[PDB]
PDB file of C-alpha atoms and ligand atoms in Angstrom:
ATOM      1  CA  UNK A   1       0.000   0.000   0.000  1.00 49.43           C
ATOM      2  CA  UNK A   2       2.821   2.434   0.777  1.00 51.21           C
ATOM      3  CA  UNK A   3       4.745   4.471  -1.736  1.00 50.67           C
ATOM      4  CA  UNK A   4       8.190   3.127  -2.596  1.00 49.29           C
ATOM      5  CA  UNK A   5      11.220   5.410  -2.392  1.00 47.10           C
ATOM      6  CA  UNK A   6      11.841   7.300  -5.633  1.00 46.31           C
ATOM      7  CA  UNK A   7      14.225   5.851  -8.217  1.00 45.88           C
ATOM      8  CA  UNK A   8      17.924   6.419  -7.684  1.00 47.07           C
ATOM      9  CA  UNK A   9      19.121   9.647  -9.272  1.00 44.51           C
ATOM     10  CA  UNK A  10      22.792  10.021  -8.285  1.00 46.90           C
ATOM     11  CA  UNK A  11      25.362   7.232  -7.935  1.00 49.33           C
ATOM     12  CA  UNK A  12      28.972   8.348  -7.408  1.00 47.43           C
ATOM     13  CA  UNK A  13      30.166   4.865  -8.370  1.00 47.33           C
ATOM     14  CA  UNK A  14      28.825   5.191 -11.920  1.00 48.74           C
ATOM     15  CA  UNK A  15      31.245   6.892 -14.348  1.00 47.06           C
ATOM     16  CA  UNK A  16      30.460  10.406 -15.457  1.00 47.98           C
ATOM     17  CA  UNK A  17      30.640  12.156 -18.796  1.00 46.24           C
ATOM     18  CA  UNK A  18      28.911  14.947 -20.657  1.00 41.74           C
ATOM     19  CA  UNK A  19      28.148  14.340 -24.307  1.00 41.59           C
ATOM     20  CA  UNK A  20      26.479  16.163 -27.152  1.00 42.68           C
ATOM     21  CA  UNK A  21      23.502  13.850 -27.012  1.00 44.75           C
ATOM     22  CA  UNK A  22      23.102  13.964 -23.226  1.00 43.36           C
ATOM     23  CA  UNK A  23      23.188  17.758 -23.318  1.00 42.68           C
ATOM     24  CA  UNK A  24      20.500  17.696 -26.016  1.00 44.14           C
ATOM     25  CA  UNK A  25      18.380  15.297 -23.975  1.00 44.14           C
ATOM     26  CA  UNK A  26      18.380  17.643 -20.979  1.00 41.81           C
ATOM     27  CA  UNK A  27      18.385  21.072 -22.638  1.00 43.39           C
ATOM     28  CA  UNK A  28      16.124  20.326 -25.641  1.00 41.45           C
ATOM     29  CA  UNK A  29      14.151  17.102 -25.183  1.00 42.55           C
ATOM     30  CA  UNK A  30      13.364  17.186 -21.478  1.00 42.55           C
ATOM     31  CA  UNK A  31      13.099  20.972 -21.363  1.00 43.86           C
ATOM     32  CA  UNK A  32      10.543  21.003 -24.194  1.00 44.64           C
ATOM     33  CA  UNK A  33       8.418  18.254 -22.650  1.00 45.16           C
ATOM     34  CA  UNK A  34       8.703  19.813 -19.180  1.00 43.89           C
ATOM     35  CA  UNK A  35       7.227  23.136 -20.323  1.00 47.53           C
ATOM     36  CA  UNK A  36       4.369  21.494 -22.246  1.00 48.28           C
ATOM     37  CA  UNK A  37       0.853  22.055 -20.931  1.00 50.34           C
ATOM     38  CA  UNK A  38       0.477  18.274 -20.425  1.00 49.72           C
ATOM     39  CA  UNK A  39       3.709  17.750 -18.481  1.00 48.69           C
ATOM     40  CA  UNK A  40       2.387  17.988 -14.938  1.00 49.68           C
ATOM     41  CA  UNK A  41       1.239  14.353 -14.389  1.00 48.37           C
ATOM     42  CA  UNK A  42       4.754  13.283 -15.411  1.00 46.48           C
ATOM     43  CA  UNK A  43       6.970  15.739 -13.501  1.00 48.10           C
ATOM     44  CA  UNK A  44       7.380  13.651 -10.322  1.00 44.34           C
ATOM     45  CA  UNK A  45       6.993  10.093  -9.076  1.00 45.44           C
ATOM     46  CA  UNK A  46       3.386   8.972  -8.789  1.00 43.65           C
ATOM     47  CA  UNK A  47       2.315   9.582  -5.181  1.00 44.20           C
ATOM     48  CA  UNK A  48      -0.131   6.697  -5.038  1.00 42.71           C
ATOM     49  CA  UNK A  49      -0.967   7.387  -1.389  1.00 43.80           C
ATOM     50  CA  UNK A  50      -1.912  11.040  -1.959  1.00 43.37           C
ATOM     51  CA  UNK A  51      -3.655  10.331  -5.268  1.00 40.42           C
ATOM     52  CA  UNK A  52      -5.593   7.407  -3.740  1.00 41.61           C
ATOM     53  CA  UNK A  53      -4.200   4.890  -6.255  1.00 41.65           C
ATOM     54  CA  UNK A  54      -3.634   1.899  -3.969  1.00 43.79           C
ATOM     55  CA  UNK A  55      -2.853  -0.525  -6.813  1.00 44.49           C
ATOM     56  CA  UNK A  56      -0.363   1.651  -8.704  1.00 44.24           C
ATOM     57  CA  UNK A  57       2.814  -0.019  -7.384  1.00 44.70           C
ATOM     58  CA  UNK A  58       1.149  -3.407  -7.471  1.00 42.76           C
ATOM     59  CA  UNK A  59       1.000  -2.934 -11.262  1.00 47.79           C
ATOM     60  CA  UNK A  60       3.986  -0.675 -12.043  1.00 48.23           C
ATOM     61  CA  UNK A  61       7.295  -2.206 -10.948  1.00 46.83           C
ATOM     62  CA  UNK A  62       9.641   0.033 -12.987  1.00 46.66           C
ATOM     63  CA  UNK A  63       8.261   3.505 -12.148  1.00 45.39           C
ATOM     64  CA  UNK A  64       9.835   6.425 -13.982  1.00 44.51           C
ATOM     65  CA  UNK A  65       8.999  10.104 -14.357  1.00 42.65           C
ATOM     66  CA  UNK A  66      10.555  13.253 -15.818  1.00 44.21           C
ATOM     67  CA  UNK A  67      11.594  14.650 -12.426  1.00 45.28           C
ATOM     68  CA  UNK A  68      13.742  11.558 -11.924  1.00 44.11           C
ATOM     69  CA  UNK A  69      15.045  11.705 -15.497  1.00 45.87           C
ATOM     70  CA  UNK A  70      15.982  15.376 -15.078  1.00 47.41           C
ATOM     71  CA  UNK A  71      17.904  14.627 -11.874  1.00 47.56           C
ATOM     72  CA  UNK A  72      19.607  11.644 -13.517  1.00 50.11           C
ATOM     73  CA  UNK A  73      20.823  13.892 -16.344  1.00 50.14           C
ATOM     74  CA  UNK A  74      21.920  16.581 -13.892  1.00 49.46           C
ATOM     75  CA  UNK A  75      23.915  14.001 -11.879  1.00 51.14           C
ATOM     76  CA  UNK A  76      25.516  12.325 -14.916  1.00 55.13           C
ATOM     77  CA  UNK A  77      23.726   9.077 -14.060  1.00 54.29           C
ATOM     78  CA  UNK A  78      23.493   8.057 -17.724  1.00 54.67           C
ATOM     79  CA  UNK A  79      26.553   7.279 -19.822  1.00 53.42           C
ATOM     80  CA  UNK A  80      24.731   6.618 -23.125  1.00 53.52           C
ATOM     81  CA  UNK A  81      21.906   8.761 -24.466  1.00 51.41           C
ATOM     82  CA  UNK A  82      19.860   5.638 -25.178  1.00 50.64           C
ATOM     83  CA  UNK A  83      19.686   4.925 -21.426  1.00 50.73           C
ATOM     84  CA  UNK A  84      17.842   8.208 -20.994  1.00 49.51           C
ATOM     85  CA  UNK A  85      15.610   7.522 -24.008  1.00 47.55           C
ATOM     86  CA  UNK A  86      14.752   4.160 -22.464  1.00 49.68           C
ATOM     87  CA  UNK A  87      13.647   5.852 -19.222  1.00 52.18           C
ATOM     88  CA  UNK A  88      11.303   8.134 -21.205  1.00 55.92           C
ATOM     89  CA  UNK A  89       9.918   5.071 -22.974  1.00 56.54           C
ATOM     90  CA  UNK A  90       9.400   3.307 -19.629  1.00 56.38           C
ATOM     91  CA  UNK A  91       7.512   6.345 -18.336  1.00 56.97           C
ATOM     92  CA  UNK A  92       5.147   6.323 -21.321  1.00 53.89           C
ATOM     93  CA  UNK A  93       4.670   2.546 -21.274  1.00 53.01           C
ATOM     94  CA  UNK A  94       3.793   2.640 -17.578  1.00 54.96           C
ATOM     95  CA  UNK A  95       1.093   5.198 -18.338  1.00 56.90           C
ATOM     96  CA  UNK A  96      -0.397   2.964 -21.047  1.00 62.18           C
ATOM     97  CA  UNK A  97      -0.312  -0.065 -18.732  1.00 61.10           C
ATOM     98  CA  UNK A  98      -1.992   1.595 -15.769  1.00 61.94           C
ATOM     99  CA  UNK A  99      -4.497   3.890 -17.502  1.00 58.85           C
ATOM    100  CA  UNK A 100      -7.249   3.097 -19.961  1.00 58.35           C
ATOM    101  CA  UNK A 101      -7.850   4.446 -23.448  1.00 57.64           C
ATOM    102  CA  UNK A 102     -10.061   7.479 -23.310  1.00 56.71           C
ATOM    103  CA  UNK A 103      -8.582   8.517 -19.961  1.00 56.08           C
ATOM    104  CA  UNK A 104      -7.383  12.096 -20.095  1.00 56.14           C
ATOM    105  CA  UNK A 105      -3.883  11.082 -19.033  1.00 60.11           C
ATOM    106  CA  UNK A 106      -3.541   8.702 -22.000  1.00 61.48           C
ATOM    107  CA  UNK A 107      -4.294  11.502 -24.483  1.00 61.74           C
ATOM    108  CA  UNK A 108      -1.711  13.597 -22.637  1.00 61.67           C
ATOM    109  CA  UNK A 109       0.899  10.858 -22.739  1.00 62.92           C
ATOM    110  CA  UNK A 110       0.311  10.228 -26.439  1.00 66.36           C
ATOM    111  CA  UNK A 111       0.868  13.896 -27.260  1.00 67.71           C
ATOM    112  CA  UNK A 112       4.010  14.129 -25.135  1.00 67.83           C
ATOM    113  CA  UNK A 113       5.347  10.888 -26.602  1.00 68.24           C
ATOM    114  CA  UNK A 114       4.835  12.082 -30.185  1.00 63.87           C
ATOM    115  CA  UNK A 115       6.720  15.271 -29.288  1.00 63.28           C
ATOM    116  CA  UNK A 116       9.471  13.229 -27.612  1.00 67.56           C
ATOM    117  CA  UNK A 117       9.866  11.022 -30.682  1.00 68.63           C
ATOM    118  CA  UNK A 118      10.004  14.050 -32.959  1.00 67.43           C
ATOM    119  CA  UNK A 119      12.795  15.594 -30.872  1.00 64.75           C
ATOM    120  CA  UNK A 120      14.736  12.280 -30.767  1.00 65.09           C
ATOM    121  CA  UNK A 121      14.665  12.275 -34.569  1.00 67.81           C
ATOM    122  CA  UNK A 122      16.998  15.324 -34.346  1.00 70.19           C
ATOM    123  CA  UNK A 123      19.504  13.785 -31.920  1.00 68.24           C
ATOM    124  CA  UNK A 124      22.830  15.554 -32.664  1.00 67.37           C
ATOM    125  CA  UNK A 125      26.142  14.129 -33.818  1.00 69.52           C
ATOM    126  CA  UNK A 126      27.975  11.752 -31.473  1.00 72.19           C
ATOM    127  CA  UNK A 127      31.626  12.203 -30.434  1.00 72.65           C
TER     128      UNK A 127
ATOM    129  CA  UNK B   1      -7.765   5.104 -12.902  1.00 72.66           C
ATOM    130  CA  UNK B   2      -6.540   8.661 -12.360  1.00 72.54           C
ATOM    131  CA  UNK B   3      -9.610  10.543 -13.449  1.00 74.48           C
ATOM    132  CA  UNK B   4     -10.315  13.687 -15.379  1.00 73.76           C
ATOM    133  CA  UNK B   5      -7.444  16.075 -15.972  1.00 73.54           C
ATOM    134  CA  UNK B   6      -8.737  18.218 -18.813  1.00 72.63           C
TER     135      UNK B   6
HETATM  136 CL1   CL C   1      32.823  14.472 -20.055  1.00 76.16          CL
HETATM  137 CL1   CL C   2       2.286  21.223 -16.827  1.00 76.44          CL
HETATM  138 CL1   CL C   3       3.633  -4.425  -4.557  1.00 80.22          CL
HETATM  139 CL1   CL C   4      -9.752   7.222 -14.673  1.00 81.06          CL
HETATM  140 NA1   NA C   5      27.714   9.982 -17.266  1.00 83.73          NA
HETATM  141 NA1   NA C   6      22.537  16.366 -19.663  1.00 81.40          NA
HETATM  142 NA1   NA C   7      17.598  24.492 -22.238  1.00 86.55          NA
HETATM  143 NA1   NA C   8       2.068  23.315 -24.392  1.00 88.30          NA
HETATM  144 NA1   NA C   9       6.136   6.967 -10.448  1.00 91.12          NA
HETATM  145 NA1   NA C  10       9.132  -6.441 -12.669  1.00 90.33          NA
HETATM  146 NA1   NA C  11       5.765   5.728 -13.245  1.00 92.13          NA
HETATM  147 NA1   NA C  12      -7.643   9.203 -24.052  1.00 92.09          NA
END
């Protein structure tokens, strides 16, 4: 019934680098989604206690959200850009597992995901 | 499961 702790966001044992694509993921991809009118359900871990969603963490075992992704980027948690992309994909997939078609949040997720995929199609040159 | 948001 209780909320789990949030996902890890900083691990000093993981190696650290800044790359063209990671910069783009934070400063273009995440920034653009974050400022979108539909971002708010996705800006923090799902607080299933406060939202009265007792089954959320019974169903969703790999939670992910843009607040966590932002902190992971800021703490150099990801080495490869595709690790970050995978976390965005996990976030969207979770939404489509937990929520039903026609639910407002699904329309929101679909719009944000289409925007995400469009921005990923302009991923910049790798080192 | 999360209700109206619009
Ligand atoms: Cl570096
Ligand atoms: Cl918002
Ligand atoms: Cl559980
Ligand atoms: Cl609902
Ligand atoms: Na890194
Ligand atoms: Na970054
Ligand atoms: Na920026
Ligand atoms: Na918007
Ligand atoms: Na969550
Ligand atoms: Na699992
Ligand atoms: Na989640
Ligand atoms: Na919908």
